[PDB]
Motif scaffolding. Structure first.
Motif, short mmCIF file in Angstrom:
data_model
loop_
_atom_site.label_atom_id
_atom_site.label_comp_id
_atom_site.label_asym_id
_atom_site.label_seq_id
_atom_site.Cartn_x
_atom_site.Cartn_y
_atom_site.Cartn_z
N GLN A 134 0.82 -1.21 0.00
CA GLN A 134 0.00 0.00 0.00
C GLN A 134 0.86 1.26 0.00
OE1 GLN A 134 -0.92 2.28 2.87
NE2 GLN A 134 1.02 1.63 3.78
N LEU A 135 2.04 1.22 0.62
CA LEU A 135 2.95 2.35 0.52
C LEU A 135 3.40 2.56 -0.92
CD1 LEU A 135 5.68 3.39 2.97
CD2 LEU A 135 6.23 3.26 0.54
N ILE A 136 3.72 1.47 -1.63
CA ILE A 136 4.09 1.59 -3.03
C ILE A 136 2.93 2.14 -3.84
CG2 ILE A 136 4.92 0.35 -5.05
CD1 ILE A 136 5.96 -1.75 -2.80
N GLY A 137 1.71 1.69 -3.53
CA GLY A 137 0.54 2.22 -4.21
C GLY A 137 0.38 3.72 -3.99
N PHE A 138 0.58 4.17 -2.75
CA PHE A 138 0.49 5.59 -2.46
C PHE A 138 1.58 6.37 -3.19
CE2 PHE A 138 2.15 9.10 0.15
CZ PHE A 138 1.11 9.99 -0.01
N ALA A 139 2.78 5.79 -3.27
CA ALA A 139 3.85 6.45 -4.02
C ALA A 139 3.47 6.59 -5.49
CB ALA A 139 5.15 5.65 -3.88
N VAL A 140 2.88 5.55 -6.07
CA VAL A 140 2.43 5.63 -7.46
C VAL A 140 1.37 6.71 -7.61
CG1 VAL A 140 1.20 4.38 -9.27
CG2 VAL A 140 3.06 3.26 -8.02
N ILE A 141 0.42 6.76 -6.67
CA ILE A 141 -0.65 7.76 -6.74
C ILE A 141 -0.06 9.16 -6.68
CG2 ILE A 141 -2.69 8.66 -5.59
CD1 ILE A 141 -2.85 5.59 -4.49
N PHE A 161 3.00 10.13 -7.43
CA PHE A 161 3.72 10.42 -8.67
C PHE A 161 2.75 10.81 -9.78
CE2 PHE A 161 4.67 8.28 -12.75
CZ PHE A 161 5.57 9.21 -13.24
N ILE A 162 1.65 10.07 -9.92
CA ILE A 162 0.67 10.40 -10.95
C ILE A 162 0.10 11.79 -10.71
CG2 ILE A 162 -1.56 9.76 -11.93
CD1 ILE A 162 -0.65 6.81 -10.79
N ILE A 163 -0.22 12.10 -9.45
CA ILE A 163 -0.79 13.41 -9.13
C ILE A 163 0.18 14.51 -9.52
CG2 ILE A 163 -1.43 14.92 -7.23
CD1 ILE A 163 -3.64 12.98 -8.07
N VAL A 164 1.43 14.41 -9.06
CA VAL A 164 2.41 15.46 -9.34
C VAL A 164 2.66 15.57 -10.83
CG1 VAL A 164 4.79 16.18 -8.97
CG2 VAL A 164 3.46 15.26 -7.06
N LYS A 165 2.60 14.45 -11.56
CA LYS A 165 2.91 14.48 -12.98
C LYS A 165 1.79 15.11 -13.79
CE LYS A 165 5.35 13.32 -16.67
NZ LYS A 165 4.49 14.01 -17.67
N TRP A 166 0.53 14.81 -13.46
CA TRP A 166 -0.59 15.17 -14.31
C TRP A 166 -1.53 16.20 -13.70
CZ3 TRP A 166 1.19 10.05 -15.12
CH2 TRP A 166 1.47 9.74 -16.46
N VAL A 167 -1.95 16.02 -12.45
CA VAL A 167 -3.03 16.84 -11.91
C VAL A 167 -2.50 18.15 -11.35
CG1 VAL A 167 -4.84 16.92 -10.18
CG2 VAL A 167 -4.44 14.81 -11.46
N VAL A 168 -1.37 18.10 -10.63
CA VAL A 168 -0.87 19.31 -9.97
C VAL A 168 -0.60 20.43 -10.96
CG1 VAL A 168 1.18 20.21 -8.83
CG2 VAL A 168 -0.10 18.33 -7.80
#
Lengths: 50, 57
Positions: free
Chosen positions: A7-14, A16-23
């Motif tokens: 779940q920590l790896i999942g949060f890291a992926v989330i 990364f996706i947020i910073v890459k696309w949404v932010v």
């Protein structure tokens, strides 16, 4: 605690996706609104001076 | 509410600045024309009085 690692790896992926696309787009929207209000203030001051 | 009032009053003040400068040159031209007409009246009445005086003499 293997599930904790997963779940920590999942949060890291989330994150990364947020910073890459949404932010970036939301940051652009905030910058646009801040610039708009700043321009309105400057234009009001200029109008009063005029 | 304050920001909306600021925007509306700024637009109204730009319009008012334009209208006030417009009325400025309008009144300037009006009073200049009035002064020129008064000067013309001065000249015309002086000329008429002189004409009457010379005719009588």
């Amino acid at each position: 605690m293997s599930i904790f690692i997963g779940q920590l790896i999942g949060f890291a992926v989330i994150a990364f996706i947020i910073v890459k696309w949404v932010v970036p787009p939301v940051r652009t929207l905030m910058r646009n609104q801040q610039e708009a209000v700043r321009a309105a203030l400057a234009e009001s001051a200029e109008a009063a001076k005029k | 509410a304050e920001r909306e009032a600021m925007l509306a009053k700024t637009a109204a003040d730009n319009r008012k600045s334009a209208e006030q400068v417009a009325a400025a040159q309008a009144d300037y031209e009006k009073e200049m024309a009035e002064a020129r007409a008064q000067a013309s009246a001065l000249r015309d009445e002086a000329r008429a009085a002189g004409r009457s005086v010379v005719d009588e003499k």
